[PDB]
Amino acid sequence: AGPVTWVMMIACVVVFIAMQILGDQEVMLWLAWPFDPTLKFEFWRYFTHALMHFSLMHILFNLLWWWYLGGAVEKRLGSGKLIVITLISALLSGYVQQKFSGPWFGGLSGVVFALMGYVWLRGERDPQSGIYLQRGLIIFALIWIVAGWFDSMANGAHIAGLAVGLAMAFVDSLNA
């Protein structure tokens, strides 16, 4: 449990608290993916969608997975690796979710699915990294995706994240 793991758990709790004081919609207006081309130069929105959660159980569920897996990446591969997985995965899972269903979505599961993808593949192709995902959880992960197809989930985020995490994990398991 290091600096980037906790800095992101604080950001999500801080933003969650603001959504309870200001209301979901008020925060959404400022942190969500650009809904209007004129807003395209509001840099933060490509990332900030990931900090917003809509219930306590989803914030809990998400931050816990972020702790288990994100903490594992930071501990073993360092803070710069977790930053880069987070920024790339948040941007691209955002970009895909926007095309599938438009800009009104939020949550850290985009990033979480890239973490589950990276930790699983990296731990199979470069075991020496010191990270791994149990098969009991690669079943939970896959059941989680498919239970979103048959139904309130951001399906584009789920699958774009996962893909990003396999891609990066693959590249990093050549450079090893």
Binding site: H49, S93, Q97, W104, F105, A157, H158
Partner: peptide
């Protein structure tokens, strides 16, 4: 809205 959808849950990511």
């Amino acid at each position: 809205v959808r849950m990511a």
